[PDB]
């Protein structure tokens, strides 16, 4: 048998994606969209983070929107 | 950068052998540049086999 296990390996899935959706009350510090890069950008009361994690700075409701093409994540305080 | 990096560029009297002269600014040490050909004493600024037979014969 031809030992064609030349490619039999994978990394671990990193559980990315959006974690708190729109119209959802968050606390101060809650991680909203964990992601690679800035697929989503920080808006009002949202910080980016070290590995582009987009947490929360102030409690409130989460709403998504557009700001010159780049789509943003903001929190109404 | 416009302070004691650039060489000396002082005014310099230029003359020619024809007699033309003017006065500008150059890097020549001394100020006594002397040319032997200028833009007024140089050319281009101021401008058959059958015929050779009878010159022989």
């Amino acid at each position: 048998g031809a030992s064609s296990s030349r490619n039999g390996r994978d990394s671990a899935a990193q559980r990315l994606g959006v974690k708190r959706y729109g119209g959802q009350v968050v606390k101060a510090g809650e991680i909203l969209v964990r992601q690679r890069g800035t697929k989503f950008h920080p808006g009002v009361n949202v910080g980016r983070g070290g590995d582009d994690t987009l947490f929360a700075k102030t409690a409130g409701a989460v709403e998504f929107g557009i700001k010159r093409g780049r789509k943003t994540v903001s929190i109404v305080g | 950068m416009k302070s004691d990096i650039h060489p000396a560029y002082e005014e310099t009297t230029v003359v020619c052998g024809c007699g033309n002269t003017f006065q500008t600014r150059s890097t020549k040490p001394g100020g006594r540049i002397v040319v032997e050909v200028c833009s007024q004493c140089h050319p281009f600024y101021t401008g058959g086999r059958v015929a050779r037979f009878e010159k022989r014969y």
Partner: protein, 178 residues
């Protein structure tokens, strides 16, 4: 006051309005910059241009030039990125008019067997470029105290819109053409 600039605003400035029908006086062309470079490609090998190409354009043009580095690496020329290959000086203002004067008066008729610069050497816009072959054209360098010979090409950038509009400007300044 350089003698070619006050000659520019005396008859060259008015003779362009008869020859080309400009409505407004801000449309009259004027040379903006004169750019002089060596382009020493024999510095990827042996890397010696310090007294070579920097300390002679300082004597010819008037100020110290810019040691230009390479952009991409080319192996057929043995050229690697970030290696000095060109030496550029840019002339503006009063040192520009004192260079276009000193070129046409005492320098440019010292090309060996000179018969004129080609008037087809405009780039479709009105900017002129020609080349030289040695350093001894200019009297500010002495041939006894130099290294190997090297040449330069000279740009003359003008505000003109088309070729014959820019050809008429440099004709009145003192460039020969054939």
């Amino acid at each position: 006051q350089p003698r070619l600039k006050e000659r520019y605003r005396s008859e060259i400035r008015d003779a362009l309005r008869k020859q080309f029908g400009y409505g407004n006086v801000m449309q009259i062309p004027t040379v903006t910059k004169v750019v002089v470079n060596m382009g020493v490609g024999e510095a990827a090998r042996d890397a010696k241009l310090i007294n070579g190409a920097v300390n002679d354009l300082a004597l010819i043009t008037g100020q110290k030039p810019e040691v230009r580095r390479a952009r991409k690496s080319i192996a057929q020329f043995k050229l690697r990125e970030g290696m000095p290959v060109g030496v550029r000086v840019t002339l503006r203002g009063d040192r520009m008019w004192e260079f276009l004067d000193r070129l046409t008066s005492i320098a440019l008729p010292r090309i060996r067997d000179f018969r004129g610069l080609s008037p087809k050497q405009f780039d479709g816009v009105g900017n002129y470029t020609f080349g030289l072959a040695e350093q001894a054209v200019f009297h500010e360098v002495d041939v006894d105290k130099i290294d190997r010979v090297r040449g330069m090409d000279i740009n003359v950038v003008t505000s003109a819109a088309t070729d014959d509009e820019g050809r008429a400007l440099l004709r009145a300044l003192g460039f020969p053409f054939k």
